[PDB]
């Protein structure tokens, strides 16, 4: 939409297992999120070492497999939603019983900055996923600006909503080469993030056709072109649909002498792939869930899925 400010949840049917397989969490911001949870109506199940800490991880890969594995191995669950991101799900994968996870009924599993690595490596294993908030931003101390604060919450409800089938679409912007219609998979997410499993078991699955969407935050410019170069030299990027840039937040210009836009201007047409911008989806206030894996199309100024 613009996007829509409707922050109504839909019902969740079912359970939600809680996971933390990247970094870890704090004890006030956690309990903050069940409340909310609570709230909403949502039951839930909490993953039993989602307090460890192995450094700035949330416990070590044993830990967090264990929980991973637990979330498909229980009946009554619904959907899968990682608390944090931030950095590790990557080491998850060498261990992890991909078996397991396709033996269970379906449940998408949800997340955003680091969780894209898994997001990626369920679409490769037939896995429903979304890019989406992680569960603890229910738990965050509010945003001092009411209208960002209400964006926030506009993006968590975005994943029941999802979940229910009820939004369709976010807005974009084309930006460069062709305006045709492009058709195909949603992939992607964090740039950071999946240029650092390029050359690994868990690089980005990315078959012909799809729309790559890409997001970051925190970099320099320059980190930002050597992690798109690694990410598009690594995959088949000349017969990707499109790619379709979420926010870059807190990635200041400092004075670099070609803008952003510029320069994932040259990327795309080098490729010839259009790219489009301005998706709702990223590090910022606005992280508007989408279906991971799934087709959607991009078409004027919107992303539609069905
Ligand atoms: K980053
Ligand atoms: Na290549």
């Avoid at 800490?53 to 990682?82: K, S």
Wanted: net charge negative; aromatic share 6%; charged share 20%.
């Amino acid at each position: 939409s613009r996007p829509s400010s409707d922050q109504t949840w839909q019902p969740i049917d079912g359970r939600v297992a809680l996971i933390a397989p990247a970094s870890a969490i704090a004890t006030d911001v956690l309990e903050a999120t069940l409340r909310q949870l609570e709230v909403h109506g949502v039951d839930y199940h909490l993953g039993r070492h989602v307090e460890a800490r192995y450094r700035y991880l949330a416990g070590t890969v044993e830990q967090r497999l264990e929980d991973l594995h637990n979330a498909f191995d229980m009946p009554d669950i619904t959907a899968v939603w990682c608390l944090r991101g931030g950095y590790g799900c990557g080491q998850l994968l060498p261990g992890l019983d991909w078996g397991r996870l396709q033996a269970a009924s379906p449940r998408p599993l949800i997340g955003f900055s680091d969780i894209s690595v898994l997001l990626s490596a369920f679409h490769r294993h037939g896995l429903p996923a979304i890019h989406g908030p992680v569960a603890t931003g229910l738990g965050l101390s509010p945003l001092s600006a009411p209208r960002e604060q209400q964006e926030r919450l506009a993006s968590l409800a975005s994943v029941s909503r999802l979940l229910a089938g009820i939004d369709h679409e976010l807005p974009v912007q084309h930006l460069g080469g062709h305006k045709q219609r492009v058709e195909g998979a949603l992939i992607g997410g964090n740039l950071t993030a999946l240029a650092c499993m390029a050359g690994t078991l868990g690089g980005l699955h990315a078959p012909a056709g799809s729309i790559l969407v890409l997001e970051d935050v925190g970099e320099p410019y320059y980190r930002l072109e050597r992690s798109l170069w690694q990410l598009l030299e690594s995959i088949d990027a000349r017969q990707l649909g499109a790619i379709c840039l979420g926010s870059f937040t807190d990635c200041p210009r400092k004075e670099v002498a070609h803008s952003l836009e510029r320069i994932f201007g040259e990327y795309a047409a080098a490729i010839e792939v259009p790219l489009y911008h301005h998706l709702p989806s990223g590090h910022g206030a606005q992280n508007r869930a989408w279906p991971y894996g799934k087709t959607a199309v991009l078409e004027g100024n919107r992303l539609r899925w069905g």
